[PDB]
Each structure stands twice: as structure tokens, then as C-alpha cells.
Amino acid sequence: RGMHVPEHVAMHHTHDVGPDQCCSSVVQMIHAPPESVWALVRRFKVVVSGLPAVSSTERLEILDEERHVISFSVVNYRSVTTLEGTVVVESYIVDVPPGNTEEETLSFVDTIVRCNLQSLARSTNR
Amino acid sequence: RGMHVPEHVAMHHTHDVGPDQCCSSVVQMIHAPPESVWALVRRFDNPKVYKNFIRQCRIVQLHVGDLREVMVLPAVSSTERLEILDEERHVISFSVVGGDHRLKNYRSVTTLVVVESYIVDVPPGNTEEETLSFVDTIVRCNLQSLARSTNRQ
């Protein structure tokens, strides 16, 4: 967006759009210290079942302990995650393969992140 | 929370866990008044108010006995009722009669002590350590989504 401190969020959360490629931002912050949050955002659970099958092909491309950055990816995703307490932004990338529209998908890959960075705040109250 | 909590968590939750009919609770706590909590949640018209992964939803000619047409990827679509809309003792329950989807019998009791009880005809022709975990997580996200939208935190 142009956050409070988009500084390590810069090169990362900056993703290239495309003709089929997409991406978006988030608002979820925590008041427990940041390194106490990183703690949990470092140990690779949050398929979720539902549909008959469930596949993924994930991979780590960035790991930064000193400044706090872990970039997920697929084998298209390219999730990036950043940080009196702490902030936690979010962004990713994706595909609209014939079958839907961005206002279902990026709102199908949107709604989950809140339910993933919301899971993180409970575990570090405030 | 605690043990003086049956006030309306008796005549509801004390409920028929039959043979293939499972259920489970939900630890959640919000710093707004239960009245402030209730308004956000009361809204059965739009479940979107706070409930996740939903899509557009209508009704039938909100009320007690008036059906709705919520819908959620590939395919699946949910059709519910509102057996109980108790507005004084914060309680909503609603069954998914006339649904399109797999997961069978339902009566999602959301009472406020803030707890959501779910029931699922134990079999979707599948496991049981998954039927609970598939939904109980779905449940999880929503009440967590309930919390956010009111200034609990």
C-alpha cells in the first residue's frame, strides 16, 4: 500500500502483475514482541480437505532471521510474509486458469490469509 | 467460561449426540458488550457480516422459519433455516435443510457465554477425524471473524 514502514516489505510485497498473474495486501498486527511472533512464523502448519482431492507443491525461496522474511512458493504461488509490539502485512501471487474470475479467486485466496494471520494473533495475545 | 454457564447452555447444548451424529464446542472471548457482540452476530440476513468464504444469500416468503440460500474453488452451495432467533438471551440456531451439499444434518447453535455448537450427521461417506476438523476449523475461522469485527481486539 505504502504502509507505516514498507521497508523490508518493499522488494518483497512488490510483485509483478500479469495477464493471468495476480496478488494483494492485508491488515493484521500483534502487540506481543515481533521476534515472539516470528517464532511462530518460522516453523513451517498454519490440505483443508473439502473437495475430493487435495494437492500442493510448496518451496522456501527466502529465509531471513535478522530482519524477519519467509517467502513461500509453489511448483503458481509466491507468498511473502513480513513484520509497543509488532506489525504483520501479507502478499502473494497467483493464477486465474479458465474456470473462475479474480473477484472469486483473489477473494478465495484472500479470505484464507485473514484466517491464517488471525490464527497467529491468538497465539500471541494483544 | 467456567461453571455458572448453563443459563442458556443447558436447554441447548445438552443435546443428542446419537450414533453417527457428532458435535463440538468453541473457546472464544470478546471484550465488547455481549449486546455489541450480539448485533454483529444476530445478522442472519447477511451472514457475510462476519462469516467467511460465503457468497450471495437470499431468503423465502430475519425471522424464525424463513429459509436462506448461502453458497461458498469448484462447486457446493448451502441452504439453511433459523429455528431459533432468541434476541434477549443471545442465541441463534439454524439447520441446513434444503442444502445442495454433502455435510448432512446441522443445527449450529451460536449462544452468548460465547459458544458455537455444531452438529454433523457423522458421515459424509468419509472419515470422522476430518468431518469434525474440516468444519470445526470453518467454525473456528468465523467466530474468530466475529471477534475481529467488533472491538474485542
Numbering used by the authors:
A (entry chain C): 37 to 80, 84 to 85, 111 to 139, 147 to 154, 160 to 202
B (entry chain A): 37 to 97, 101 to 111, 115 to 154, 163 to 203
What sentences appear in the manuscript?
A 13-member family of ABA receptors PYR/PYL/RCAR (PYLs) in Arabidopsis thaliana was genetically and biochemically identified. Upon binding (+)-ABA, dimeric PYLs underwent a pronounced conformational rearrangement, and then bound and inhibited the group A protein phosphatases type 2Cs (PP2C), including ABI1, ABI2, HAB1 and PP2CA. PYLs/PP2C heterodimer blocked substrates binding to PP2Cs, and thus released downstream transcription factors SnRK2 kinases formerly inhibited by PP2C. Structural analysis along with biochemical data in vitro demonstrated that steric hindrance and hydrophobic interaction in the pocket of PYLs were crucial for their stereospecificity to ABA enantiomers.
PYL5 and PYL9 represent two extremes of recognizing (−)-ABA. PYL5 bound (−)-ABA most strongly, so we first tried to acquire the complex crystal of PYL5 with (−)-ABA. However, the X-ray diffraction data showed that it was highly twinned and could not be merged together. In addition, X-ray diffraction images from apo-PYL5 crystal also showed a highly twin. Nevertheless, the apo-PYL5 structure was solved at a resolution of 2.68 Å. On the contrary, the corresponding two residues in PYL5 and PYL3 were smaller, and thus allowed (−)-ABA to dock into the binding cavity. In addition, the dramatic contrast of binding (−)-ABA between PYL5 and PYL9 also denied the “flip” hypothesis, which supported the hypothesis of dual selectivity of ABA receptor.
